[PDB]
Every structure is written in structure tokens, then in C-alpha cells.
Amino acid sequence: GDQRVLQSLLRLEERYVPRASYFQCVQREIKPHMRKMLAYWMLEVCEEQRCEEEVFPLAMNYLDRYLSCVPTRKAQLQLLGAVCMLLASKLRETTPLTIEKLCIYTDHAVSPRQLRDWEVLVLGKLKWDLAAVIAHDFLAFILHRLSLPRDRQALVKKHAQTFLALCATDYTFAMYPPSMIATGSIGAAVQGLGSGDELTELLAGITGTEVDCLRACQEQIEAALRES
């Protein structure tokens, strides 16, 4: 049933977690602040197109993985961002984003020609391995394993997703396992919607994470929110 799916999901995470901190590879022109500045632009686009909640974080997943092995330049950052957006959408949406819709969002600084080529470029560099496991993919499962009814899951799930989006924007969570980001931001949500020890141990028992980690993680997310 669901237990078989969790085990597999957990297994995969390691494969779709950026290999290293790349700000020593793109040291010429890349900077952590630019990576976040780009993140908020990706968030605007997705919230604007009402994309599936999963696209953004997924797109950021592609970004980090690409920046890990490929030293790109400052001016090509926006171009790279759109491609990741595109791909993420193409993989996880019924009606994905067209290269023209993204073209107008780049204020026409990125021609449709560039978008087609770079889509192939990013795919090759990521070896077409895009079916990545991201934090969001843990929501449904860890929500079912709770003491809450679907009767109230609507608000909890929505609130949890802003924490999920938060993480994707903040580089400090980039290297974090999707499961921890999920179980952590979903704890920050449930606790803000109505103790803590009994809650954190319930969540940890699900994803097999440690109670210590979960707490420090959950607290860091809540801290990152207020200081964003």
C-alpha cells in the first residue's frame, strides 16, 4: 500500500540532492544572493501561472544540480532559470508552460531560440534524469499518517506549502534531504494551526528521521520565514 511507496521514495532522495555547494565553482560571477533573487522570480512566475505547487521546488532542484557541475555566467542566469521552470512544468503538469509564455516573462531578453537550445543543454547536463524526488512529494503520505481528518487537511496542506516554497528560495536548505524539508515544514505548519514533542516524534517516526534533526530543522525553517 502506502508503506511500500514511502520506503522507495526515501531510498531515492540521495540521488536528487545536489552533490555539493557550487559557489566555489561559479566564483567568478555567481553569488548566493543572485541565486535567491532568481528564486523569487521563479516563484512569481509559478504563482502567476498557477502552476502545480511542485514545479517551483523541482525547477530549483534542476538549477542547483546544473550549477553544481556547470560554471555558467551572470547574464545567462535568467535564461537558465526559465529552462528549469519549463522542464519542471513539462514533467509534472497536465498543461505545461510554453516557451512563449516564459519568453514574455523574461521581458523578451530571452529569445525563443535560446530556450529551445538550452532545454537540450540542461537535459544533457542532468542526463535527462528529471523525475526527481522533492520535499513536496512527501506531503500526502505524511499527512495521511497523522491524527487529522481530511475534513481539515485543506488549510494545513496550503500553509505547509509556503514553508516548502520558502525552503526552495533559501540556499541553506538546498542540500537538505527532501524528506526532512517536508517533515520539517509540515511540522511548522501543523504547530501553527494547532504538544510539540509528541508531534515531532510522530513526524520523525514516519520518515525515519531523528527527533533531534527534525527539531533543529523545523526551528530553522520558522526562523528563516521571519527573516526572509
Partner 1 sequence: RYEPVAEIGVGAYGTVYKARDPHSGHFVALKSVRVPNGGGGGGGLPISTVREVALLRRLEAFEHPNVVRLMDVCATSRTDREIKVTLVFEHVDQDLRTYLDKAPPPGLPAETIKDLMRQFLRGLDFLHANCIVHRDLKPENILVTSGGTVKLADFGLARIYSYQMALTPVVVTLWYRAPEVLLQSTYATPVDMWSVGCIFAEMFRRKPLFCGNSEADQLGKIFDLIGLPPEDDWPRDVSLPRGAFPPRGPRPVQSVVPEMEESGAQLLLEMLTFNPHKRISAFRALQHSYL
Cell of 204: 520523525
Nearer to partner 1, 115 or 165 (CB): 115
CB 42 within 8 A of CB 59: yes
Burial class (CB within 10 angstroms; exposed 0-12, middle 13-18, buried 19+) of 121: middle
The verdict on 44 binding a copy of itself (CB under 8 A) reads: yes
Separation between Cα atoms, residue 64 and residue 20, nearest integer Å:
9
Query: What's the min distance (Å) between Cβ of 151 and a copy of itself?
Result: 6
The verdict on 119 binding a copy of itself (CB under 8 A) reads: no
Taking CB within 5 to 8 Å according to partner kind, which of a copy of itself, partner 1, none is near residue 158?
a copy of itself
Q: CA torsion angle for 170, 69, 25, 33 (degrees, to 10)?
A: -20
CA atoms within 13 A on the CB side of 110: 23
Count of residues interacting with partner 1 (CB under 8 A): 26
Contact set for a copy of itself, span 47-76 (CB under 8 A)? 47, 50-52
The secondary structure element, H or E, covering residue 141 is helix 139-144
Contact set for partner 1, span 8-37 (CB under 8 A)? 8, 11-12, 15
DSSP secondary-structure letter at 15? G
Taking CB within 5 to 8 Å according to partner kind, which of a copy of itself, partner 1, none is near residue 159?
a copy of itself
Contact set for partner 1, span 48-87 (CB under 8 A)? 87
Count helices and strands in the chain by DSSP H and E runs:
11, 0
Phi, psi of 179 (to 5 degrees): -60, -40
The one among 48, 117, 201, 212 contacting partner 1 by CB under 8 A = 117
Nearer to partner 1, 96 or 184 (CB): 96
The verdict on 98 binding partner 1 (CB under 8 A) reads: yes
Nearer to partner 1, 107 or 197 (CB): 107
The verdict on 226 binding a copy of itself (CB under 8 A) reads: yes
Separation between Cα atoms, residue 166 and residue 10, nearest integer Å:
22
**Residues in the site for a copy of itself, rule: CB under 8 A?**
37, 40-41, 43-44, 47, 50-52, 150-155, 157-159, 161-162, 165-166, 169, 192-194, 225-228
